[PDB]
Short mmCIF file of C-alpha atoms in Angstrom, two decimals:
data_model
loop_
_atom_site.label_atom_id
_atom_site.label_comp_id
_atom_site.label_asym_id
_atom_site.label_seq_id
_atom_site.Cartn_x
_atom_site.Cartn_y
_atom_site.Cartn_z
CA UNK A 2 -8.89 -2.16 9.83
CA UNK A 3 -12.00 -3.83 8.38
CA UNK A 4 -12.72 -5.16 4.87
CA UNK A 5 -15.31 -2.46 4.29
CA UNK A 6 -12.75 0.23 5.16
CA UNK A 7 -10.12 -1.66 3.13
CA UNK A 8 -12.32 -1.45 0.04
CA UNK A 9 -13.00 2.26 0.64
CA UNK A 10 -9.29 3.17 0.98
CA UNK A 11 -8.33 1.03 -2.01
CA UNK A 12 -10.88 2.95 -4.10
CA UNK A 13 -9.67 6.33 -2.76
CA UNK A 14 -6.04 5.69 -3.61
CA UNK A 15 -6.90 4.18 -6.99
CA UNK A 16 -8.96 7.19 -8.10
CA UNK A 17 -6.20 9.57 -6.91
CA UNK A 18 -3.58 7.66 -8.90
CA UNK A 19 -5.80 7.67 -12.00
CA UNK A 20 -6.11 11.47 -11.71
CA UNK A 21 -2.36 11.90 -11.25
CA UNK A 22 -1.42 9.66 -14.17
CA UNK A 23 -3.93 11.38 -16.49
CA UNK A 24 -2.79 14.83 -15.35
CA UNK A 25 0.70 13.71 -16.42
CA UNK A 26 -0.47 12.29 -19.75
CA UNK A 27 -0.78 16.01 -20.39
CA UNK A 28 2.97 16.29 -19.78
CA UNK B 2 4.86 18.97 -13.10
CA UNK B 3 5.16 15.52 -14.67
CA UNK B 4 7.68 14.64 -11.96
CA UNK B 5 5.59 15.69 -8.97
CA UNK B 6 2.62 13.77 -10.32
CA UNK B 7 4.82 10.67 -10.59
CA UNK B 8 6.13 11.04 -7.05
CA UNK B 9 2.57 11.51 -5.75
CA UNK B 10 1.47 8.44 -7.75
CA UNK B 11 4.19 6.24 -6.23
CA UNK B 12 3.33 7.55 -2.74
CA UNK B 13 -0.34 6.55 -3.22
CA UNK B 14 0.66 3.25 -4.84
CA UNK B 15 2.78 2.42 -1.81
CA UNK B 16 -0.32 2.94 0.34
CA UNK B 17 -2.23 0.57 -1.97
CA UNK B 18 0.53 -2.03 -1.73
CA UNK B 19 0.47 -1.75 2.07
CA UNK B 20 -3.30 -2.42 2.06
CA UNK B 21 -2.87 -5.49 -0.18
CA UNK B 22 -0.18 -6.81 2.19
CA UNK B 23 -2.57 -6.35 5.14
CA UNK B 24 -5.24 -8.28 3.24
CA UNK B 25 -2.97 -11.15 2.26
CA UNK B 26 -1.75 -11.53 5.86
CA UNK B 27 -5.35 -11.62 7.15
CA UNK B 28 -6.28 -14.28 4.59
CA UNK B 29 -3.20 -16.38 5.32
CA UNK B 30 -4.08 -16.47 9.03
CA UNK B 31 -7.69 -17.37 8.27
CA UNK B 32 -6.94 -20.18 5.81
CA UNK B 33 -4.29 -21.55 8.20
CA UNK B 34 -6.87 -21.58 11.02
CA UNK B 35 -9.33 -23.46 8.78
CA UNK B 36 -6.64 -25.99 7.74
CA UNK B 37 -5.76 -26.63 11.39
CA UNK B 38 -9.42 -26.87 12.37
CA UNK B 39 -10.01 -29.55 9.74
CA UNK B 40 -6.84 -31.36 10.78
CA UNK B 41 -7.89 -31.25 14.43
CA UNK B 42 -11.33 -32.57 13.52
CA UNK C 2 12.68 9.41 -22.27
CA UNK C 3 13.38 8.34 -18.70
CA UNK C 4 10.20 10.16 -17.66
CA UNK C 5 7.86 8.56 -20.18
CA UNK C 6 9.17 5.13 -19.28
CA UNK C 7 8.41 5.87 -15.61
CA UNK C 8 4.89 7.06 -16.37
CA UNK C 9 4.26 3.96 -18.50
CA UNK C 10 5.67 1.78 -15.68
CA UNK C 11 3.31 3.29 -13.10
CA UNK C 12 0.37 2.89 -15.51
CA UNK C 13 1.14 -0.84 -15.91
CA UNK C 14 1.82 -1.22 -12.18
CA UNK C 15 -1.59 0.25 -11.42
CA UNK C 16 -3.10 -2.46 -13.65
CA UNK C 17 -1.12 -5.07 -11.68
CA UNK C 18 -2.34 -3.63 -8.38
CA UNK C 19 -5.93 -3.74 -9.65
CA UNK C 20 -5.52 -7.45 -10.51
CA UNK C 21 -4.11 -8.21 -7.04
CA UNK C 22 -7.09 -6.40 -5.46
CA UNK C 23 -9.47 -8.53 -7.56
CA UNK C 24 -7.68 -11.66 -6.38
CA UNK C 25 -7.71 -10.73 -2.72
CA UNK C 26 -11.45 -9.92 -2.86
CA UNK C 27 -12.18 -13.30 -4.50
CA UNK C 28 -10.17 -15.13 -1.84
CA UNK C 29 -11.79 -13.22 1.02
CA UNK C 30 -15.26 -14.21 -0.22
CA UNK C 31 -14.20 -17.84 -0.62
CA UNK C 32 -12.57 -18.20 2.80
CA UNK C 33 -15.57 -16.45 4.40
CA UNK C 34 -17.92 -18.94 2.69
CA UNK C 35 -15.81 -21.86 4.00
CA UNK C 36 -15.77 -20.40 7.54
CA UNK C 37 -19.56 -20.01 7.49
CA UNK C 38 -20.02 -23.49 6.03
CA UNK C 39 -18.00 -25.01 8.87
CA UNK C 40 -19.87 -22.91 11.42
CA UNK C 41 -23.21 -23.98 9.95
CA UNK C 42 -22.13 -27.62 10.03
CA UNK D 2 -12.13 -12.76 -14.95
CA UNK D 3 -10.65 -16.22 -14.28
CA UNK D 4 -7.46 -17.27 -12.46
CA UNK D 5 -5.91 -18.50 -15.69
CA UNK D 6 -6.53 -15.10 -17.31
CA UNK D 7 -5.38 -13.39 -14.09
CA UNK D 8 -2.04 -15.17 -14.31
CA UNK D 9 -1.68 -14.30 -18.01
CA UNK D 10 -2.34 -10.56 -17.48
CA UNK D 11 -0.08 -10.44 -14.43
CA UNK D 12 2.73 -11.88 -16.56
CA UNK D 13 2.02 -9.45 -19.43
CA UNK D 14 2.16 -6.37 -17.24
CA UNK D 15 5.21 -7.63 -15.34
CA UNK D 16 7.25 -8.21 -18.51
CA UNK D 17 6.23 -4.78 -19.87
CA UNK D 18 7.34 -3.09 -16.64
CA UNK D 19 10.66 -4.98 -16.68
CA UNK D 20 11.27 -3.72 -20.24
CA UNK D 21 10.37 -0.13 -19.30
CA UNK D 22 12.55 -0.07 -16.19
CA UNK D 23 15.53 -1.56 -18.06
CA UNK D 24 15.04 0.85 -20.97
CA UNK D 25 15.31 3.62 -18.36
CA UNK D 26 18.37 2.11 -16.67
CA UNK D 27 19.87 3.38 -19.91
CA UNK D 28 18.79 6.88 -18.88
CA UNK E 2 18.24 13.02 -8.39
CA UNK E 3 14.45 13.06 -8.12
CA UNK E 4 14.33 10.87 -11.23
CA UNK E 5 16.74 8.19 -10.05
CA UNK E 6 14.91 7.94 -6.75
CA UNK E 7 11.65 7.39 -8.67
CA UNK E 8 13.17 4.71 -10.87
CA UNK E 9 14.61 2.95 -7.81
CA UNK E 10 11.21 3.22 -6.08
CA UNK E 11 9.40 1.57 -9.01
CA UNK E 12 12.06 -1.17 -9.16
CA UNK E 13 11.50 -1.97 -5.46
CA UNK E 14 7.72 -1.67 -5.85
CA UNK E 15 7.82 -4.21 -8.66
CA UNK E 16 9.58 -6.59 -6.25
CA UNK E 17 6.81 -5.95 -3.70
CA UNK E 18 4.13 -6.61 -6.32
CA UNK E 19 5.86 -9.87 -7.27
CA UNK E 20 5.79 -10.98 -3.61
CA UNK E 21 2.07 -10.16 -3.30
CA UNK E 22 1.39 -12.20 -6.46
CA UNK E 23 3.29 -15.15 -4.95
CA UNK E 24 1.19 -14.85 -1.80
CA UNK E 25 -2.13 -14.66 -3.61
CA UNK E 26 -1.26 -17.73 -5.72
CA UNK E 27 -0.32 -19.71 -2.58
CA UNK E 28 -3.60 -18.74 -0.89
CA UNK E 29 -5.68 -19.56 -3.96
CA UNK E 30 -4.20 -23.08 -4.09
CA UNK E 31 -4.78 -23.58 -0.37
CA UNK E 32 -8.40 -22.39 -0.33
CA UNK E 33 -9.12 -24.47 -3.45
CA UNK E 34 -7.68 -27.56 -1.70
CA UNK E 35 -9.90 -26.90 1.34
CA UNK E 36 -13.00 -26.41 -0.87
CA UNK E 37 -12.30 -29.71 -2.65
CA UNK E 38 -11.61 -31.49 0.63
CA UNK E 39 -14.98 -30.39 2.00
CA UNK E 40 -16.69 -31.35 -1.25
CA UNK E 41 -15.03 -34.76 -1.20
CA UNK E 42 -16.08 -35.27 2.41
CA UNK F 2 9.85 -18.99 -0.28
CA UNK F 3 8.22 -19.09 3.17
CA UNK F 4 5.76 -16.69 4.84
CA UNK F 5 8.38 -15.65 7.38
CA UNK F 6 10.78 -14.75 4.57
CA UNK F 7 7.90 -13.14 2.65
CA UNK F 8 7.22 -10.81 5.57
CA UNK F 9 10.93 -9.97 5.91
CA UNK F 10 11.35 -9.07 2.21
CA UNK F 11 8.11 -7.09 2.17
CA UNK F 12 9.42 -5.02 5.09
CA UNK F 13 12.84 -4.55 3.43
CA UNK F 14 11.40 -3.25 0.18
CA UNK F 15 8.84 -1.08 1.96
CA UNK F 16 11.47 0.68 4.11
CA UNK F 17 13.69 1.22 1.04
CA UNK F 18 10.80 2.78 -0.88
CA UNK F 19 9.93 5.04 2.07
CA UNK F 20 13.55 6.26 2.13
CA UNK F 21 13.58 6.88 -1.63
CA UNK F 22 10.27 8.75 -1.66
CA UNK F 23 11.31 10.94 1.29
CA UNK F 24 14.72 11.60 -0.25
CA UNK F 25 12.79 12.87 -3.29
CA UNK F 26 10.37 14.97 -1.22
CA UNK F 27 13.56 17.00 -0.91
CA UNK F 28 13.51 17.41 -4.70
#
């Protein structure tokens, strides 16, 4: 693991979560 | 639907948490090495 | 009710996670700067 | 963002989550 | 069942988050002390 | 709190969460 990859994966998971939470806002 | 989205969100959040733990451990080792370096100097 | 509370909890937890990521990035830059300083010295 | 503000926001979100989780303990 | 597992997961994740916050605060104090030490030197 | 205890508790909570998430995969 590197810090560049760390930042990439953080961003990936964050955007996925945002999408999931929003998609649930529309219960 | 709402439930599966929540489960998937927690799953991804657990991955995030695991990455933050990795980062904190890396930083702790690095600051400790610096502290010891300065002490040894 | 239980479901909306869980969604709201995840939403707030995602904000927390984002703050911890900010912190870790700040610290990484600062320890790296110190390491380089000592190397340059 | 500052560390003083960081601590404040951390505390805000943490107390909110506590309230939400408890309020759900009462399913 | 699915719901109680999710609540329990968030509860445990909040404990994890609290530990990461503790860690980050510790590290921030330690790097700050090192930065000041080097400045004072 | 020490770093050794920190690591232990992190691992405890992580394994619990894994078990809970899996046990829910079986909705």
